[PDB]
Each structure stands twice: as C-alpha cells, then as structure tokens.
Design a protein around this ligand. Structure first.
Ligand code: LYS
Ligand code: VAL
Ligand code: CA
Ligand code: CA
Ligand code: CA
Ligand code: CA
Ligand code: KR
Ligand code: KR
Ligand code: ZN
Ligand code: ZN
Length: 316
C-alpha cells in the first residue's frame, strides 16, 4: 500500500521485544519499505487461501499473542534479506529486490512452513509438535532460501537434487541464524519444535543420525517417501557442510575446518554459478571443489577441506 514508513514495536513468538518496519495509511501495515521492493506480511486467518490480508494494526503496537507469529515472520525476513545483501551482495531472492511476502496463521494446528513458489507460509503448529514456526530464524531463512535456490540453481525437488535443495536451505538457514547471533547452533528448528521437550530439534547438521538421518552416502534412502527422501538424504550434505566449517573426524576421515564465512562463500558460489536443476551429490562435490578453487586456488586448504568433507560422507 502507499503510505509513510513507520516503526512499530511488538513481541515475537518467544516473547522477545523487537522493532518492526511498518507502513501507515489509516492503519499500520506490516510493510517494510526499507528493504528492496518491500517486505510484506499477511494474515491467513487460520484458513488456506493465500496470501490472505496484508497485516493491519490500529496502533503500531504488536504485543497480542495473535500478533507474535507476524512480528517474527516480518522481522526474520528482514534479517534474511540483510544477510544475503550484506554477505553475498544479493538483493532479495531474485537478485533484483523482489518483494518478499509471508503469510502467518496458515490453516489450523499446521505443523509446518513452506515456500509455495511465490511466498513464505507459516503454520501456528498444534502447540505440542510445534509452536508458530516463524519463531525460528533458521526456519524463516530456510524457507526464503528455497526462493533463492528456485531463482538460481533451480534444483528439482526430488531424489538427490532435492536433497541438495534441502541442504542448501538448512545450510543458509543456519548461517543466517549465526549472522543474527542469538543462541546460534547447527540444529534446525530448535526454537519452535516441541515446547515440552528441551534440547531437541527437527534435524541436526552436526549429527544427522541423532534424528535418524544418514550421515554417509552408504546410508542414503532410496525409497519414494518424502519425494525420494529430500529431508532425509539432506543429512549427508548437511554433515559435509558442517565438516567443512567446523572440522572433525567422521568414519575415520579427518577434515580441517575453514569456518562459516568460507563455507557460505563456497556454497553460495556453487549455488549460483555451477549447480543446475538436475545436479546430483557427485556434481555438488565438483561444484563445491570448483567454487573453492575459484575463490582460494586449486592447492588451497579450502579446496583440500571440501574434498575431505565429501570423502568423509562417501560422496566421490
Ligand atoms: N519441513 C519438513 C520437516 C517436517 C516439519 C513439520 N512436519 C517436512 O516438511 O518434511
Ligand atoms: C519446518 C521447516 C524447517 C521446513 N518446512 C521442513 O523442513
Ligand atoms: Ca496493535
Ligand atoms: Ca538456535
Ligand atoms: Ca538452529
Ligand atoms: Ca523442543
Ligand atoms: Kr525486497
Ligand atoms: Kr533473500
Ligand atoms: Zn521444506
Ligand atoms: Zn525445505
């Protein structure tokens, strides 16, 4: 909507206070004009029609429980925009400052979130398995990273290319979590998963096997569940990315860590310059090796560590 840029204040899903960029025209809308062509947050009002209504508020204060998922979807979309712009020189998900749209309160008791090809969508959870999923910055950044992937490599969402697609979203969801630097970790969704249980998460990058996901190519899932296991076999690539950043010895193979920033540079370059819609794990290894070679040189430690990491998870 056309109006003047304002700054509201509210509380997110975890009860933290934060300022949000809004737009005033009769009401205060969750419309941030400070980032590209805008960040827009919508109310789906417990239904499944999308996007729903641009979020309107009478007084620019967002402290109601009903407000919290909107506050966080809006705010963490901003953080994710800032990450891609400041760290990778990328302007929104299409690289040309496309408007970022999110809907919250999708359906009833909906234990998931997704990118639907056009926008981010967040359930409220059922209060047992999940609380509202926009409360997790790694979740928000995971979903928006699907938009980035769709505009760049375009990895098909099935089998190995789908597992790479998923891992890219977990990798950059995690790097955005570290960028924001509030209790960051290498786990996925811990802030919104199972409020009755402390210390768990939906997936682990540091130890995918903790939640039954493979950490080696030899344990890859080859059935048809989950689009050929895209959220399962992602553990193999997530482990490799973890090893590249943090180092470690895995099934006897030692990897020298090169840190998060270099992990991010290598995988961002692979994603945007080398991966294609049909890339498999072997081709991801080649893309990462070539990316690391471009950035640091063929005889660099960075290239050596990429190779060790993929060796360690059985991807040749
Ligand atoms: N996002 C993943 C994990 C489940 C989250 C909610 N059931 C999926 O759709 O498979
Ligand atoms: C829940 C979230 C992390 C994502 N839609 C799955 O995986
Ligand atoms: Ca209000
Ligand atoms: Ca965390
Ligand atoms: Ca996390
Ligand atoms: Ca939990
Ligand atoms: Kr934007
Ligand atoms: Kr983005
Ligand atoms: Zn997903
Ligand atoms: Zn995903």
């Amino acid at each position: 909507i056309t109006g003047t840029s304002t700054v509201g204040v509210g509380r997110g899903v975890l009860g933290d206070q934060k300022n949000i960029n809004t737009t005033y025209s009769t009401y205060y809308y969750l419309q941030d004009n400070t980032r590209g062509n805008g960040i827009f947050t919508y109310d789906a009002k417990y239904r499944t029609t999308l996007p729903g209504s641009l979020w309107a508020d009478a007084d620019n204060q967002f402290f109601a429980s009903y407000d919290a998922p909107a506050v966080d979807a809006h705010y963490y979309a901003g953080v994710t925009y800032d990450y891609y712009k400041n760290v990778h020189n990328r302007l929104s998900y299409d690289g040309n400052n496309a408007a970022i749209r999110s809907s919250v309160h999708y359906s009833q008791g909906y234990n998931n979130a997704f990118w639907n090809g056009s926008q981010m969508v967040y359930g409220d959870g059922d209060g047992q398995t999940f609380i509202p999923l926009s409360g997790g910055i790694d979740v928000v950044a995971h979903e928006l990273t699907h938009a980035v992937t769709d505009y760049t490599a375009g990895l098909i969402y099935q089998n190995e290319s789908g597992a790479i697609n998923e891992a890219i979203s977990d990798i950059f969801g995690t790097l955005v979590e570290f960028y924001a630097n509030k209790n960051p970790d290498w786990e996925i969704g811990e802030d919104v998963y199972t409020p009755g249980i402390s210390g768990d998460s939906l997936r682990s990058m540091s130890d995918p096997a903790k939640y039954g996901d493979p950490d080696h190519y030899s344990k890859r899932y080859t059935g048809t569940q989950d689009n050929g296991g895209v959220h399962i076999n992602s553990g193999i690539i997530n482990k490799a990315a973890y090893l590249i950043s943090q180092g470690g010895t895995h099934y006897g193979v030692s990897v020298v860590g090169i840190g998060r920033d270099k992990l991010g540079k290598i995988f961002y370059r692979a994603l945007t310059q080398y991966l294609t819609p049909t890339s498999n794990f072997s081709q991801l290894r080649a893309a990462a090796v070539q990316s690391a070679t471009d950035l640091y040189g063929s005889t660099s430690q960075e290239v050596a560590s990429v190779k060790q990491a993929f060796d360690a998870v059985g991807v040749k």
